[PDB]
């Protein structure tokens, strides 16, 4: 149930967007659940339903940012024909920033979100391109 | 023990889920807390007994002796709380926010 | 406290960490942790104020369940290896439990909620012990088992702590809680390098102890639990204004002072090990910690807050002096940097 | 790290092996720093306790400048050993496992062709 | 009979399920006593008498009597909340049944349960012709062979008195 | 099993009585003293435990250490009692 | 450990009883004492990093004396077939299961 | 495989008499037959594998068997009275029967000459020399891995000093 997410990376970027979007949407959604959970455990709700709603809101919003990121990056790559280009991701990251912005009904957040999120995603692309290692084993 | 040590372990996790989700009375946690010490004591004694490792039986009891005092401290805090708030209810414990 | 009781308790609060450190049989390491839990609770409720009972009852439940989880790890190991101690072979989940549990007793990352609250309801004095002579014990257990723990989790708890500590601190105005939050942060750096170079954890701790112990004996010299309270320091005792300034900027990583070394060598060791992703993000939000440190600087030193007439009365009376330890631990802390090579 | 080394003295400060190393010159800048670090501690104390800063506790000033320094010689004596062990350990390995640390050969700059990026 | 230990172990789990669902403090205490007895029998099933019976002496009548005691003066009456005790009872029963099928499911995964191997593992090896191999001979190493285990515990109790009196004061 | 047989008859005999008995017919009391006693009780109850293996430990080859240990345990707890007396504890 | 006040002082309050092969009371040898020895006299002088690959034969065995799972498996496997075979009427427990009894 | 010996290989005569009978005569069996007993035992301990010391074991039963046949020949009636009284007791305690014991023990000191071993003098360790080569590599130990090599030499002041960032040191 992990061989899955990884698949996103295996096929060249810009190709098989369907899978990409699905995977990206799941990750966002997973984060949504976790995020809602912390948001409900602490700062609890008033009624069971109210909290179920939260969970839903956070889950969907996160799933959305996941989708548009996946969709935009894949499509940009295909259209721009740059199979591996950090910018592709930035376009996508920005997209997620905007979505989040919408779901929060704020243009400003979209601004915050477009740059920060995009930059972050772009760095992910570079990271993969340059073989950056995260959480590395001690090799001293 | 292969599946008799899974019941005890899940007992400890069911007791884990208990101590971590409070509800009203604090005593129920403490009491739950103790449910773990019993499960740990039972598991330690069980494996020591089927490993014939007699050099280790001291531990099953040291676990209980330390756990008893641990609980003594826990209850004195509890008595201290229903002396200051007239109840053991946890909600009362929200001044440090 | 009947001075006899004071001795028994204090001995236990001190035998508690020492047994942990000295023993190798994990069990004996667990009871060392258990004795620390039992000894600290009496002192925590010394005023017996309504806030205090809350503090102890939280500290105790958080400490107790973690203690039980640590014992479960030892009990499980006993069946996966007859030994009473973690070994290369240990199941990974067995070690991760010990990390979470021990990261609760030390209060790192997503388990950082109890510390700020217990640091708020206990006296300044017992605050120090609860922050620095109670971190030695669990850390010892981790440092001993470092070869075996996971690099991923530690890093996540490390980064989280840094963030939570920083963000939490920005809003807080109560000093006790500002320190509680700083400790969460520094504790984070410490656990970041544990998997790679334990010896640096022991430096990032000592320096934290040599920094926090002077800082708290400063807060209590005037027993100010408010920044507004520490801000009138200029009237109550003017000299400590100079060193309080440097020690707090030292607690954050600014380069001339001793406080840079722990962050600098931890970053050097992480880059040596290639975590230039993780190290970078940590150093960046580490900079957030200095912002709240300097905001306090502003109130206490760089700007003079208005004081009360009744203060002139406290000036008249001779001010009970700060122990010598303050000085020796203020200087060795604010400026030892020129002697870093031998420290590491 | 360096613990677990053969012969490790389980609780000793500086094993006698450290006798072989040169003793720290008492005027080593570092020990002299510790001295100044100390004098300042003393002066600071006087200040926090509201005493004439320099003209008071002239006995203490001495205890300080002389406690810190005393500590230094015996600490530096050790830290110097620790570093010295590090080489013994490091250099030895380079040899015992020679192949892993081969002496590669560097060509003269004539042979090497470094690309020239014009500044223009 | 060969399942004697599985069953006992099963009931223990339920007992703990009860404590977890946090029924009224005193009924929960009853729960810990039931699990306590079940557990004692478990240890008394793998060949350990002293360890087990001690569970009874120190923990069944010894420790929880206290719990019930304090749960008599300070934990109020669980008043106006008693109704849940029935709901909790239900979930408990439902959960028990759930687990019933649950382990059946785990049994399916042969890849432990040793459904056939039940009663073949409660004990593994014995000194058939031995004499002094009784649980307890070990518990006594605490006085001689291992004394650390006693000096540490002893301190706990001693310090305990001073601590509890100080917290209580 | 033999014990199990006896015990279930024992419960059966009692449940039989109560059943026939019900079928044939056709808020803040608290004193720390009480809590304190319960506590002391376990501190003593735990000690009883550390003292229970003494029958097996008598036969220990050491003997000297046995007694040296046992005497220390009994003495340190008794001192605990001593301080309980000295303090208002045990004075209800 | 972190502070070896025990080796230094020469005392051994915590080391004598850490493994199953330590001195058991009345010399009643533990179980798996045939292996733990073989698995710790092997890993003595060789650090862990190299007590984890080459001294894997002795742990793979000691992981089976204690857990004794491969046995459980083999046995469980045997029974299954016996069950299926007994279904076909193929296997009929020999009276050896109920033979004389050797002293 | 397991090389478990075959039944025919392990089919030897045994005493097969009530525990009490062995017990009643035990003291004299520990006397008349330890030469071989010990040997089997020494074989047993040093060569952990019973399979290896099986032969010695067949000798054990045999020696005892005749031990019994000789008893059967002389002072048999006495022995019969001693065991019957010894068996009645639940722990087959020796002191309940001393009058019967004296007869048989006395008789075997008239007819067989054998002697009841005085208190002790059976517990004391014995030396029996056996041809079976002191099993080398018992435990079938594999080869012990090589100890890490040893850095050698004497310390020399560190090279160029602490090489920390810009510290001429
Ligand atoms: C073993 C190791 C285990 C490690 C576990 C680490 C867990 C970390 C998560 C939090 C842990 C517990 C905690 O302290 O959280 C309290 C926090 C309290 O929030 P709350 O009380 O629910 O909010 C009050 C109002 O409802 C606030 O009003 P609001 O809810 O309207 O404001 C949000 C609004 C407007 O939102 C904004 O404008 C800001 C958006 C920020 C997005 C990114 C936030 C997280 C940044 C991480 C870096 O948009 C929304 O309403 C939600 C839309 C859907 C968003 C879904 C985002 C899922 C994020 C999942 C993050 C998981 C960790 C990473 O609970 C959380 O929200 C948890 C997620 C975010 C935590 C805060 C950021 C902490 C980040 C530290 C570093 C973590 C990553 C690096 C390590
Ligand atoms: C990267 C480094 C950056 C450094 C600068 C930034 C870091 C430090 C910032 C400090 C200030 C931060 C902001 C805090 C609030 C400031 C404004 C305020 O309200 O202050 C109230 C505060 C009120 O105190 P007060 O009521 O006057 O109490 C004193 C009595 O009046 C009685 O006073 P008195 O008049 O009787 O005192 C006379 C005594 C005054 O003595 C001192 O105050 C010594 C202070 C040492 C501070 C070291 C800081 C190191 C930082 C790194 O005279 C001496 O002891 C002469 C020797 C002093 C030497 C100090 C520098 C030595 C450096 C090494 C020199 C070369 C080596 C050979 C030395 C040979 C010496 C014979 O004003 C101060 O006294 C400040 C004292 C500290 C000055 C530190 C200057 C360090 C310069 C570097
Ligand atoms: C908070 C935690 C606690 C505080 C911090 C503690 C920090 C330290 C922790 C230490 C942990 C234990 C460390 C040692 C054990 C582990 C290491 C080890 O392997 O040592 C084994 C070794 C075994 O015993 P041993 O020392 O060899 O026995 C002495 C002789 O070797 C025996 O050989 P022997 O043939 O000479 O036999 C003696 C016999 C011999 O008699 C004859 O055979 C006569 C013919 C020959 C005559 C010449 C030889 C005999 C000469 C007279 C006896 C001298 C030796 C015996 C001395 C006994 C007193 C030391 O004569 C006697 O019976 C003398 C009786 C004396 C009775 C004293 C009763 C005191 C009761 C308490 C009073 C109030 C306090 O050490 C021990 O286990 C005993 C010492 C440790 C006691 C427990 C821990 C005490 C410290 C904590 C106290 C606070 C606890 C609070 C709870
Ligand atoms: C408030 C003040 C601070 C604010 C302003 C200053 C801010 C500075 C911020 C610095 C931040 C970076 C921290 C690292 C600095 C550099 C560290 C370093 O150089 O390490 C390598 C260095 C080893 O090589 P080296 O000392 O450069 O080589 C010199 C030769 O060996 C030749 O030396 P030698 O072996 O011949 O030494 C013997 C020499 C005495 O030795 C020394 O005192 C040498 C002092 C200068 C050392 C060179 C660095 C100078 C940096 C300025 O002659 C004597 O024995 C005379 C009698 C003893 C002294 C009596 C007078 C004492 C008061 C003056 O280790 C040290 O320097 C240890 C001392 C600590 C560094 C200097 C003091 C810290 C910086 C000034 C703070 C002032 C308070
Ligand atoms: C160079 C960087 C430039 C960034 C953009 C600069 C301009 C930003 C701006 O003008 O808006 C600030 C924003 C305004 O938002 P406002 O209209 O107040 O509504 C808030 C509703 N919550 O201020 C706000 O109140 C909203 C702030 C939102 C902050 C979070 C936005 C997403 C951050 C994602 C960070 C990266 C996450 C992944 C790693
Ligand atoms: C859990 C998963 C992560 C958290 C998800 C919920 C996050 C939001 C929490 C909001 C506050 C809690 C109520 C909602 C969650 C819940 O299920 O109840 C926990 C329960 C609350 O108790 P109470 O004080 O009655 O609160 C009722 C509030 N309407 O408190 C208790 O249940 C106390 C007893 C805890 C242990 C009960 C037994 C657990 C094991 C049951 C059998 C196995 C079940 C496996 C699934």
D47: nearest CA partner in chain C: C239
What is the Rg, in whole angstroms, of the alpha carbon atoms belonging to chain D? 25
Distance CA C261, CA C257 (A): 8
Residue A116 distance to chain C (closest CA, Å): 14
Judging contacts by C-beta atoms under 8 Å, the chain E residues touching residue F71 are none
Query: Alpha-carbon torsion A23, A26, A30, A32, what sign?
Result: positive
- Chain interruptions in chain F, by residue before each (C–N > 2.5 Å): 26
In chain B, where the domains are located? 2-97
Distance CA C248, CA C292 (A): 10
3-state SS class at H159? coil
Task: Verify whether ligand 3 is closer than 6 Å to residue F76 (CB atom).
Answer: yes
Distance CA C255, CA C252 (A): 9
Judging contacts by C-beta atoms under 8 Å, the chain B residues touching residue E22 are 18, 23-25, 28-29, 32
Residue pair C190/C204 in contact by the 8 Å Cβ criterion: yes
Residue pair F46/B69 in contact by the 8 Å Cβ criterion: yes
Using a 10 angstrom Cβ sphere, with 0-12 exposed, 13-18 middle and 19 or more buried, the burial of residue H15 is middle
Distance CA E69, CA E64 (A): 8
| Nearest listed ligand to the Cα of residue E157 | 3
Judging contacts by C-beta atoms under 8 Å, the chain A residues touching residue C151 are 135-138
The residues, any chain, with a CB within 8 Å of residue H137's CB and separated by 6 or more, are none
Q: Domain total for chain F?
A: 1
- The DSSP letter of residue H8 is G
Q: Choosing among A138, A139, A140, which should be mutated to test the C contact, i.e. which has the most C CBs within 10 A?
A: A138
Give the total residue count for chain A.
140
Q: How far is the CA of F69 from the centre of ligand 3 (A)?
A: 8
Choosing among 3.40.47.10, 1.10.3720.10, 1.10.10.10, 1.10.287.3510, the CATH entry for B2-97 is 1.10.287.3510
Per-position b or e across A69-87, b if 16+ CB within 10 A of its CB: bbbbbbbbbeeeeeeebbe
C264: nearest CA partner in chain H: H165
Distance of CA E94 to the CA centre of its chain: 22
Identity of the residue in B2, B53, B58 whose CB atom sits nearest the CB atom of G20: B53
Identity of the residue in E153, E158, E166 whose CB atom sits nearest the CB atom of C1: E166
Segments in F1-92 forming alpha helices (H): 2-23, 32-51, 54-58, 64-86
Q: What is the number of the ligand 2 atom nearest to the C-alpha of C244? A: 14
G72: nearest CA partner in chain B: B2
Note whether G1 contacts C: Cβ–Cβ < 8 A.
yes
Contact between chains at C239 and D50 (C-beta distance less than 8 A): yes
Judging contacts by C-beta atoms under 8 Å, the chain C residues touching residue E155 are 12, 15, 35
Residue ranges around ligand 6 (CB below 6 Å): A 37, 40-41, 44; B 14, 17-18, 21, 23-24; E 17, 20-22, 95
Residue C38 phi, psi (nearest 5): -65, -40
Distance of CA E111 to the CA centre of its chain: 29
Contact between chains at F39 and B64 (C-beta distance less than 8 A): no
Do C and A touch, 3+ Cβ pairs within 8 Å? The answer is yes
Distance CA C188, CA C162 (A): 6
User: Which pair of structure tokens corresponds to residue B34?
Assistant: 């103790």
Q: What is the number of the ligand 4 atom nearest to the C-alpha of C255? A: 11
Residue pair G83/C123 in contact by the 8 Å Cβ criterion: no
Nearest residue (by CA) to ligand 5, atom 1, is A115
Q: Which of D22, D25, D26, D29 to mutate to test the pocket of ligand 4 (most atoms within 8 A of CB)?
A: D29
Q: What is the DSSP string of B10-63?
A: HHHHHHHHHHHS--S-SHHHHHHHHHHHHHHHHHHHHHHHHTT-GGGTHHHHHH
E159: nearest CA partner in chain C: C8
- The DSSP letter of residue E22 is -
Instruction: For tokens 């960032």, name the residue.
Output: H165
Note whether G47 contacts D: Cβ–Cβ < 8 A.
yes
Nearest residue (by CA) to ligand 5, atom 5, is A112
Residue pair H135/C314 in contact by the 8 Å Cβ criterion: no
Contact between chains at H148 and G54 (C-beta distance less than 8 A): no
User: Which pair of structure tokens corresponds to residue E33?
Assistant: 């006593």
Nearest residue (by CA) to ligand 4, atom 2, is C335
The residues, any chain, with a CB within 8 Å of residue A9's CB and separated by 6 or more, are A128
3-state SS class at C226? strand
Distance CA E113, CA E106 (A): 8
Indicate the resolution in Å: 4.2
Sheet strands (E) in chain H:
none
Q: Domain total for chain C?
A: 1
Closest CA to C120 of B84, E168, B23, B93: B93
| Nearest listed ligand to the Cα of residue E152 | 3
Contact between chains at G18 and C85 (C-beta distance less than 8 A): yes
Judging contacts by C-beta atoms under 8 Å, the chain D residues touching residue C341 are 79
Instruction: For tokens 């009990």, name the residue.
Output: C75
Do H and A touch, 3+ Cβ pairs within 8 Å? The answer is no
3-state SS class at E109? coil
Distance CA C194, CA C151 (A): 9
Task: Verify whether ligand 4 is closer than 6 Å to residue H162 (CB atom).
Answer: no
Residue ranges around ligand 2 (CB below 6 Å): C 234, 238-239, 241-242, 245-246, 256, 301, 335; D 40, 43, 47, 53-54
Nearest residue (by CA) to ligand 2, atom 20, is C242
C74: nearest CA partner in chain B: B44
Note whether F45 contacts B: Cβ–Cβ < 8 A.
yes
Q: Which of A106, A110, A122 to mutate to test the pocket of ligand 5 (most atoms within 8 A of CB)?
A: A106
Contact between chains at B52 and E125 (C-beta distance less than 8 A): yes
Q: How far is the CA of A114 from the centre of ligand 5 (A)?
A: 9
Distance CA D52, CA C48 (A): 41
Domain span at residue F35 reads 2-92
E47: left (phi over 0), alpha (psi -120 to 50) or beta: left
Contact between chains at G3 and C18 (C-beta distance less than 8 A): yes
Distance CA G54, CA D96 (A): 20
Q: Choosing among B5, B16, B26, B68, which should be mutated to test the E contact, i.e. which has the most E CBs within 10 A?
A: B68
Using a 10 angstrom Cβ sphere, with 0-12 exposed, 13-18 middle and 19 or more buried, the burial of residue D106 is exposed
Q: How far is the CA of C242 from the centre of ligand 2 (A)?
A: 8
Distance CA B75, CA E67 (A): 8
Using a 10 angstrom Cβ sphere, with 0-12 exposed, 13-18 middle and 19 or more buried, the burial of residue F78 is exposed
Task: Verify whether ligand 1 is closer than 6 Å to residue A134 (CB atom).
Answer: no
Do D and C touch, 3+ Cβ pairs within 8 Å? The answer is yes
User: Which pair of structure tokens corresponds to residue A128?
Assistant: 């993969």
Neighbours of B92 (CB within 10 A): 18
Task: Verify whether ligand 4 is closer than 6 Å to residue C338 (CB atom).
Answer: yes
CATH code for position F35? 1.20.58.1610
Closest CA to D76 of H158, F43, G66, C153: H158
- The DSSP letter of residue E118 is S
3-state SS class at C174? strand
- The DSSP letter of residue G16 is T
Judging contacts by C-beta atoms under 8 Å, the chain A residues touching residue C273 are 136, 138-140
- The DSSP letter of residue A45 is -
B69: nearest CA partner in chain C: C38
Residue pair G48/B79 in contact by the 8 Å Cβ criterion: no
Q: Within the 23-42 window of chain G, which residues sit less than 8 Å (CB to CB) from chain D?
A: none
Q: Tell me which H or E stretch contains D112.
A: none
Q: Number of B:F CB contacts under 8 A?
A: 25
DSSP bridge pairs for C174? C226
Distance CA C179, CA C215 (A): 9
Distances (CA, A) of C158 to A96, C109, C266, G30: 27, 7, 12, 42
Closest CA to C118 of C177, C68, C65: C177
The residues, any chain, with a CB within 8 Å of residue G24's CB and separated by 6 or more, are B52, B53, B54, B55, E138, G30
Judging contacts by C-beta atoms under 8 Å, the chain B residues touching residue C38 are 69-70, 73
User: Which pair of structure tokens corresponds to residue C330?
Assistant: 């203020």
Do C and E touch, 3+ Cβ pairs within 8 Å? The answer is yes
């Amino acid at each position: 149930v992990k061989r899955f997410f990884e698949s996103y990376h295996e096929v060249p970027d810009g190709t098989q967007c369907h899978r990409k979007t699905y995977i990206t949407t799941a990750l966002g959604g997973i984060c949504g659940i976790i995020g809602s959970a912390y948001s409900v455990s602490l700062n609890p709700a008033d009624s069971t339903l109210e909290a179920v709603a939260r969970v839903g809101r956070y889950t969907f919003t996160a799933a959305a940012i996941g989708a548009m990121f996946g969709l935009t990056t894949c499509v940009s790559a295909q259209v721009r024909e740059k199979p591996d280009d950090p910018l592709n991701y930035f376009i996508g990251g920005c997209a997620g920033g905007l979505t989040l912005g919408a779901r929060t009904h704020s243009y400003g957040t979209a601004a915050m979100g477009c740059v920060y999120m995009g930059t972050a995603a772009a760095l992910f692309k570079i990271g993969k391109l340059e073989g950056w290692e995260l959480f590395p084993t001690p090799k001293v | 023990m292969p599946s008799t040590f899974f019941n005890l372990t899940m007992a400890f996790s069911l007791s884990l889920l208990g101590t971590l989700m409070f509800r009203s009375h604090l005593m129920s946690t403490l009491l739950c807390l103790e449910g773990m010490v019993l499960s740990l004591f039972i598991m330690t004694s069980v494996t020591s007994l089927n490993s014939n490792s007699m050099s280790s039986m001291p531990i099953p009891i040291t676990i209980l002796v330390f756990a008893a005092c641990e609980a003594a401290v826990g209850l004195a805090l509890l008595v201290k709380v229903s002396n200051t708030y007239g109840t053991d209810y946890v909600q009362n414990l929200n001044l440090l926010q | 406290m009947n001075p006899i009781t004071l001795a028994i308790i204090y001995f236990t609060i001190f035998l508690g960490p020492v047994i942990t450190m000295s023993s190798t049989n994990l069990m004996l390491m667990w009871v060392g942790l258990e004795f620390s839990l039992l000894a600290i609770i009496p002192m925590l409720i010394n005023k017996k104020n309504p806030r205090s009972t809350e503090a102890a009852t939280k500290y105790f439940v958080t400490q107790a369940t973690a203690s039980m989880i640590i014992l479960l790890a030892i009990v499980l190991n006993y069946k996966q290896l007859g030994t009473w101690m973690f070994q290369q072979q240990t199941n990974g989940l067995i070690l991760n439990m010990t990390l979470m549990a021990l990261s609760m007793k030390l209060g790192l990352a997503p388990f950082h909620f109890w510390l700020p609250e217990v640091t708020q309801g206990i006296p300044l004095h017992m605050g120090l012990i609860l922050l620095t002579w109670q971190k030695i014990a669990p850390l010892s257990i981790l440092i001993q088992i470092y070869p075996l723990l996971n690099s991923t989790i530690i890093l996540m708890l490390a980064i989280t702590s840094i963030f939570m500590g920083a963000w939490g601190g920005l809003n807080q105005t109560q000093m006790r809680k500002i320190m509680a939050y700083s400790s969460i942060a520094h504790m984070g750096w410490m656990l970041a390098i544990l998997p790679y170079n334990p010896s640096l954890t022991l430096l990032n701790l000592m320096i934290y102890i040599i920094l926090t112990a002077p800082m708290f004996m400063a807060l209590m010299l005037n027993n100010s639990m408010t920044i507004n309270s520490i801000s009138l320091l200029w009237n109550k005792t003017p000299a400590m204004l100079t060193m309080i300034s440097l020690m707090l900027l030292s607690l954050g990583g600014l380069p001339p002072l001793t406080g840079f070394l722990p962050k600098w060598i931890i970053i050097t060791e992480l880059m040596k090990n290639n975590c230039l992703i993780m190290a970078t993000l940590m150093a960046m939000m580490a900079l957030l910690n200095l912002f709240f440190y300097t905001r306090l600087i502003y109130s206490t030193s760089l700007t003079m807050f208005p004081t009360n007439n009744n203060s002139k009365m406290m000036t008249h009376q001779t001010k009970t002096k700060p122990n010598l330890m303050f000085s020796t631990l203020a200087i060795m802390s604010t400026m030892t940097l020129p002697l870093a090579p031998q420290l590491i | 790290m360096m613990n677990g080394r053969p012969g490790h003295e389980p609780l000793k400060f500086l094993p006698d092996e450290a006798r072989s190393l040169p003793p720290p010159k008492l005027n080593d800048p570092r020990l002299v720093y510790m001295g100044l670090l100390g004098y300042c501690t003393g002066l600071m104390d006087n200040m926090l306790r509201m005493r004439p800063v320099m003209r008071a506790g002239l006995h203490r000033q001495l205890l300080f400048v002389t406690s810190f320094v005393f500590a230094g010689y015996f600490y530096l004596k050790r830290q110097n050993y620790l570093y010295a062990v590090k080489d013994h350990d490091m250099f030895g390995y380079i040899k015992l496992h020679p192949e892993d640390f081969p002496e590669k050969e560097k060509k003269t700059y004539a042979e090497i062709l470094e690309p020239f990026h014009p500044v223009r | 009979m060969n399942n004697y230990i599985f069953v006992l172990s099963s009931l223990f789990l339920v007992g703990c399920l009860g404590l977890a669902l946090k029924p009224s403090p005193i009924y929960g205490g009853l729960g810990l006593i039931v699990s306590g007895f079940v557990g004692c029998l478990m240890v008394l099933g793998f060949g350990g008498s002293f360890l087990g019976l001690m569970v009874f002496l120190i923990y069944l009548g010894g420790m929880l009597v206290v719990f019930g005691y304090t749960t008599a003066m300070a934990t109020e009456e669980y008043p106006e909340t008693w109704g849940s005790n029935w709901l909790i009872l239900g979930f408990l029963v439902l959960g028990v049944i759930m687990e019933v099928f649950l382990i059946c499911v785990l049994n399916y995964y042969d890849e432990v349960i040793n459904l056939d191997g039940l009663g073949d593992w409660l004990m593994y090896e014995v000194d058939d012709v031995g004499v002094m191999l009784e649980g307890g001979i070990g518990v006594a190493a605490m006085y001689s062979c291992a004394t650390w285990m006693m000096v540490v515990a002893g301190w706990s109790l001693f310090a305990g008195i001073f601590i509890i009196i100080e917290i209580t004061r | 099993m033999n014990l199990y047989t006896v015990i279930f008859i024992n419960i059966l005999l009692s449940l039989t009585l109560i059943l026939v008995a019900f079928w044939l017919p056709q808020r803040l009391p608290f004193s720390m003293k009480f809590f304190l006693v319960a506590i002391t009780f376990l501190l003593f109850d735990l000690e009883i435990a550390l003292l229970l293996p003494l029958p097996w430990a008598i036969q220990t080859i050491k003997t000297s250490t046995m007694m040296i240990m046992a005497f220390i345990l009994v003495t340190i707890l008794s001192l605990g009692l001593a301080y309980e007396w000295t303090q208002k504890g045990l004075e209800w | 450990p972190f502070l070896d006040i025990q080796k230094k002082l020469g005392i051994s309050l915590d080391r004598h009883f850490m493994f199953l092969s330590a001195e058991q009371p009345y010399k009643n040898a533990a179980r798996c004492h045939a292996f733990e020895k073989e698995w710790i006299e092997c890993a003595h002088g060789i650090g862990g990093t190299r007590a984890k690959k080459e001294c894997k034969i002795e742990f793979d065995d000691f992981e089976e004396c204690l857990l004794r799972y491969k046995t459980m498996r083999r046995m469980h496997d045997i029974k299954k077939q016996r069950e299926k075979l007994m279904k076909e009427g193929k296997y009929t427990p020999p009276p050896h299961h109920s033979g004389r009894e050797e002293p | 495989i397991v090389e478990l010996p075959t039944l025919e290989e392990l089919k030897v005569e045994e005493v097969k008499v009530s525990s009490a009978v062995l017990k009643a005569a035990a003291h004299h069996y520990g006397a008349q037959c330890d030469k071989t007993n010990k040997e089997f035992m020494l074989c047993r301990w040093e060569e952990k594998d019973p399979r290896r010391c099986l032969k010695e074991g067949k000798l054990v039963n045999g020696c005892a068997l005749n031990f019994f046949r000789q008893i059967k020949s002389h002072c048999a009636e006495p022995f019969t009275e001693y065991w019957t009284c010894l068996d009645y007791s639940n722990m087959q305690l020796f002191r309940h029967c001393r009058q019967q014991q004296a007869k048989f023990d006395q008789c075997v000191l008239d007819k067989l000459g054998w002697v009841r071993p005085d208190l002790g003098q059976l517990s004391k360790v014995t030396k029996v020399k056996t041809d079976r080569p002191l099993p080398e590599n018992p435990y079938h130990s594999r080869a012990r891995p090589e100890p890490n090599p040893v850095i050698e030499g004497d310390l020399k002041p560190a090279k160029h000093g602490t090489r920390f960032f810009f510290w001429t040191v």
